[PDB]
Amino acid sequence: LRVHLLNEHAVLPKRGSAGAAGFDLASCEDTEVPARGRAVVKTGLQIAIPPGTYARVAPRSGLAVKHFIDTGAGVVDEDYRGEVGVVLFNHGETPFQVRRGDRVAQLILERIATPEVVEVESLDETTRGTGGYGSTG
Amino acid sequence: LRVHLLNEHAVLPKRGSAGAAGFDLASCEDTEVPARGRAVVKTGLQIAIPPGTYARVAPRSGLAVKHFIDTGAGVVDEDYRGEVGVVLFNHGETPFQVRRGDRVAQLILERIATPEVVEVESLDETTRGTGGYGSTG
Amino acid sequence: LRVHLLNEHAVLPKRGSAGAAGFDLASCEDTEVPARGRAVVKTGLQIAIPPGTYARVAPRSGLAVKHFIDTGAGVVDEDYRGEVGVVLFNHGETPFQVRRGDRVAQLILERIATPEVVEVESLDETTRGTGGYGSTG
């Protein structure tokens, strides 16, 4: 995970334990996420990631449970070289305060497949088929 | 990524750049996502995916930032052979308009492990344990 | 996927089909997710997962479409040995009822990369660069 810090308030990502899935992402700014609203939180970070992954901006559990916070968007492509902004949603009834250095998300390097697309004129099945939504219930 | 188009308004998925994580998913219909509400957007697409993955219906960043849009649900199994419908959530205060051909999500082929389940009568730890929510804070 | 059941109302995870991406997670308790609100649903489960993954608490499609339900948080680390609680968000206008044995989420073992962090003083590009949000539109 290659990381270039873009200002002096940016914080280098790091996983909080050796079995942690994600790298902590901190705000490099003072801002607020409005109640029942969204805001983009600047991190001051540029990143370059390994082949065969994308970086997912994932939620921190404590902020979800305690402040009704989620990340929105969050699909950071391998070819993305701009500043990472964390899109926060606040579903709660009161503003969420963000200050410099505060951890606001966690970056997970999801392994993915990016094969060619093949258009076909029919597809077979398994047993499960158009097995929709509540396929079993 | 094998794709069968189910009507003439469906659009073949394609990644927008060579380092893109996801394949663009377009609506094959005119519909609306109500304010503070949800709608399923038909894509007119059937898919078959590679072994060891699932297809995640992921959000587009622009729609999240600019229209408070998210995907809901979005776990498309390997054995799913029905029409892919994109579940959109609109957390904003005004309807989100969708028209035919509009890109509404992106499909990411997430690599996953699907081993057998093993029930045990105890589990050891690391240092981190029942380290809950804000494990460090 | 190693699983220790913590009480007699807990349910062993299992995938609902052989091509299913996720292992079903059931509530071990009677509770409610308030309208436009959140609740943590206890599962009575401890888990240990394979190397190179994390367990994602993912939404069930039927609950999203039919009850406007999502999972929040949901990043369960490899070193997590506490009881898995499922964070549910209810964006709908009415309480969501949960009873013992009810399936409330699905656990997906996402493959991820967890390399060292490398801080750099510049990053090159592709064509796509600071290609932001709606990079193409």
From TrEMBL, chains A, B, C:
<keyword id="KW-0378">Hydrolase</keyword>
<comment type="similarity">
    <text>Belongs to the dUTPase family.</text>
</comment>
<keyword id="KW-0546">Nucleotide metabolism</keyword>
<comment type="function">
    <text>Involved in nucleotide metabolism via production of dUMP, the immediate precursor of thymidine nucleotides, and decreases the intracellular concentration of dUTP so that uracil cannot be incorporated into DNA.</text>
</comment>
<feature type="domain" description="dUTPase-like">
    <location>
        <begin position="10"/>
        <end position="137"/>
    </location>
</feature>
<protein>
    <recommendedName>
        <fullName>Deoxyuridine 5'-triphosphate nucleotidohydrolase</fullName>
        <ecNumber>3.6.1.23</ecNumber>
    </recommendedName>
</protein>
<dbReference type="GO" id="GO:0046081">
    <property type="term" value="P:dUTP catabolic process"/>
</dbReference>
<dbReference type="GO" id="GO:0004170">
    <property type="term" value="F:dUTP diphosphatase activity"/>
</dbReference>
<comment type="pathway">
    <text>Pyrimidine metabolism; dUMP biosynthesis; dUMP from dCTP (dUTP route): step 2/2.</text>
</comment>
<dbReference type="GO" id="GO:0000287">
    <property type="term" value="F:magnesium ion binding"/>
</dbReference>
<dbReference type="GO" id="GO:0006226">
    <property type="term" value="P:dUMP biosynthetic process"/>
</dbReference>
<keyword id="KW-0460">Magnesium</keyword>
<keyword id="KW-0479">Metal-binding</keyword>
